[PDB]
Amino acid sequence: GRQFGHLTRVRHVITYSLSPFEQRAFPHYFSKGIPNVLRRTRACILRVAPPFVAFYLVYTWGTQEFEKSKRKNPAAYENDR
Amino acid sequence: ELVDPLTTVREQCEQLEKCVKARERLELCDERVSSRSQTEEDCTEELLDFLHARDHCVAHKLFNSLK
Amino acid sequence: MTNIRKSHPLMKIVNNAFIDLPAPSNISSWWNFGSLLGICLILQILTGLFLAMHYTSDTTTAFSSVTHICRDVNYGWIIRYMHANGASMFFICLYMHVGRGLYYGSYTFLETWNIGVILLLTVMATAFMGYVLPWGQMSFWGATVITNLLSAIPYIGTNLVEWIWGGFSVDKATLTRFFAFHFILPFIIMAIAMVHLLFLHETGSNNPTGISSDVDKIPFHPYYTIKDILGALLLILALMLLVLFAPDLLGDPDNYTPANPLNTPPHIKPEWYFLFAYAILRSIPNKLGGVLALAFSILILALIPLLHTSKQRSMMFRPLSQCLFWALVADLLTLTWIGGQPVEHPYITIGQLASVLYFLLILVLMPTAGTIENKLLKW
Amino acid sequence: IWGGFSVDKATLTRFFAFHFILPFIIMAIAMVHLLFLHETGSNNPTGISSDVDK
Amino acid sequence: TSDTTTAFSSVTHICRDVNYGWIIRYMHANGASMFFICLYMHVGRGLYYGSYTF
Amino acid sequence: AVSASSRWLEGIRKWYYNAAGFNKLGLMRDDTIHENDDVKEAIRRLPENLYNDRVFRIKRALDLSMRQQILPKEQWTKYEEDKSYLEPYLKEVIRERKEREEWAKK
Amino acid sequence: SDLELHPPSYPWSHRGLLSSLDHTSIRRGFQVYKQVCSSCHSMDYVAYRHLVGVCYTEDEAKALAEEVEVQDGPNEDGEMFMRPGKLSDYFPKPYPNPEAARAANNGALPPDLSYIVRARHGGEDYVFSLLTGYCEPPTGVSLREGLYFNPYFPGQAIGMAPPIYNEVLEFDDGTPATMSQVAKDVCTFLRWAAEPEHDHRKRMGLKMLLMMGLLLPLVYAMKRHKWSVLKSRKLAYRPPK
Amino acid sequence: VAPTLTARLYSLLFRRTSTFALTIVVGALFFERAFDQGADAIYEHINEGKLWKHIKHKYENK
């Protein structure tokens, strides 16, 4: 109903925070962040890539398969007859 | 006169192997055709092949060669 | 509520559908689209208007006018492309807004989902006519078949086609009609949006974990506004770059020639998103049975919420579902490129190959997934 | 607003758009005009508080 | 059609070849007029009872 | 007819159980569950000792996800220990309605 | 299914991102059209408004225009004009009518060149290599009389008699005309014609990018700056419990 | 010890939001007059003799 008032009931939690001025926009964003980028990227790339392979394969597979099938009329039947 | 840069740049790439290499195929076609040309055979298909990579070389060169 | 300036017109108290609308803490930039979608649209209306300001719909006029637009009209070149290219962007903006729904199972909300369903169906024809408006060679021929397509109705179609034509052919009035349709139509959507939104206020947005967020909320204004602002700003270049330096990239239609009913194009394709359906369309030799599928293609979205198979909504915890999920992703994109192919024999097979797969992914695999997994965790 | 030295073509075309879209705007506004009315309700010919009888 | 050359001849053509092109055009124009006198009264009521108090 | 394979079943279980990140966020199986009607009143019948603890971990959980940090693995939940506390309450609500559902058939 | 050739990718003075056109070559590229292409293919969409773009002085382009036009204008006071007057006039067609065009071309219909660039696939290099490419009919192939073999050509038999030879003409420059130079010169000309805005449209294209990098981090910072308090939260669960 | 311009600046300008707002337009004005003036040179520096601005001098007023 009333959005902030009545949602849940919660007791004996404590919270701490600072003025945004009190702290920095990039607390080692570069150094400390780069590992975090890496670690989780693999958890996905396990389950992400495998299909993308398949298309590109088939993509070229059919591409070639398409090409010679079309490209060369005197391929199987050459122009002796 | 002026002979153009083109005809020159024409020759520099046709000098390359795959050019003359397939140019043989043209004759491999052509000569066989010359006897057998009664049948449907034509070397056009190969001509394009011949000319394709041919001017792929000719690409970069003459545009510089021109004004 | 003493001296609150948001009471005085009550209208400002309706405004608190935003600024105090709470939201869960963790929200991915995946969620920034709903915003963008509305924003992508606002621009549309405006630009899609000023066009008309110099535009004329007439069989003789329209092309030469549109010719004249980028010629003599101040910035007639920026604007037209702002309209067209901006259209494209609206799509990929849109699909993600879909993709989020699935991948977390946000579709669990039934009605809100359905509104999106209808909402989707609407948008296509808009562009469709919007694409005919150029009266280019393709636009003539493209609609020519797509409209002629509907003739496959066993009985009532015969009259009905010429009716929507208003003729034996594509002739003038068939143009003019569309203009009106294509003109009014967005306003309708904008209304519908306010419905689609509305239910959402009832139950609130969901969170990536697929878990009740009740315990932790956020005042909307200080934060998500910002991430949107940036998110909004993301869109800018995305169009700006394309629209400015390299116009003709997704401007893939090559036809600036006057539409010729005598001439027929050797290649016939709609633009991209129009293809993947049209790809399936190419597949079936049966004329009627094919159309039946194309219809059935999308609408199963609404069916999907019947397919909630598991005790956990989101797919972030189900690898296999996720495995499945990404699998389907490609099957579409293939068809796209497939529909982007002439109908030589591998493609012929290929579509036939990829076609039945598509539904099969949906219609068989996905439900059984959690069934195992429900059983797996011993749930 | 002409877009010209005279009444010529574009001055026409513009209006068409304007004259075309414009009602939809009004229809929206109506829903505002109405809205407040729900707040305080309609009045009665006597110019008197109607509270007692509805 | 809105065009300097077209519009008139088109509108000519409307009541000519268009099914009921005669009823419709007048439904539009004449119907416009009615909207006015409908409207003013809605004003007049407001004053004569002072409904403008809102 | 499974005995040794039964033993073989648990590995993938333990494996699959380890293939879903919430183990690595310190969750359990129960709090994972998608809501439902039975879910609802089930919540009612909980004692706070769990209930509150149910709360915090969730609240704990969400925050981490905000910052894209996964719990230090040492502290990850353990396939040996899964708390079923939900279900002994769940079967009640399931059961009773099935009667009403049926007893109101005829 | 003539093997669809591609004209190879040529570098261009404009090919680069910020790369622009030379108008001098354009000055020439006009001349040939002014000389040749007016044979059949016209361009209906261009006024004499060119002035400074290809650098032409108004007077020049005017006098350049005023030479061109000149048709009737006295039909019982209902007109058009001789001698264009202003430069807003477009460029006279060689043909009154698709009929007079096609029959004269013997069933061939010369396309407009106005927009022709962005129409065909293969860019301007298409025509360049097209006008470049003409080959002798390979062994065992025949043509229609008008049709001339060209490998690029989709049917590879084109009714267009190859116009260009080395020094067909002289240039307004006076640079010796070269079948290649002649070819390359007009290529830019049309390519610009379909895109008069072009060399300008990159200005803001440049201008926006310089502006562009400024804002993005600032927000992203302020973003983080606001969010900073969010990601800095600390929970403590201390049930007295 | 003197305050870094920052400590000056807020005290001077950013404190009163009007001023804080006021300066915004002010520099923005001088900004564009200088800003666009630079890029075009860079632009036309990049394209030399491709433009009438360079080209047209060949034939301009004869």
Ligand code: HEC
């Ligand atoms: C012989 C009269 C004539 C000359 C002179 C002439 N054109 Fe051609 N042109 C034609 C005709 C006729 C065709 C089409 C022939 C065919 O389709 O086989 C054609 C083909 C073309 C095409 C390609 C048509 C297509 O399908 O894309 C272009 C572009 C073109 N002309 C423009 C030019 C240009 C550029 C020049 C100067 C090199 C020129 N015309 C000079 C008559 C001419």
Ligand code: HEM
């Ligand atoms: C969801 C918003 C819109 C969609 C999907 C849409 C669809 C389209 C499309 C796809 C085009 C083709 C663009 C092109 O060919 O360059 C187009 C053009 C056009 N649209 Fe829309 N449009 C939208 C907004 C509008 C609006 C609001 C209007 C009317 C105010 C409008 C009127 C036009 C006009 C006049 C054109 C002519 C330009 C042309 O067709 O090429 N569009 N529209």
Ligand code: HEM
């Ligand atoms: C023009 C098209 C659309 C617009 C403008 C639009 C707009 C929005 C907006 C602004 C939101 C709120 C942001 C959010 O909840 O993440 C939203 C939410 C939603 N929309 Fe739409 N949407 C569109 C299309 C769709 C479609 C096609 C569907 C489904 C078929 C859909 C389903 C949803 C759902 C499920 C949500 C809530 C998701 C959640 O809270 O997790 N929307 N939409």
Ligand code: FES
């Ligand atoms: S009916 Fe014309 S192609 Fe299928």
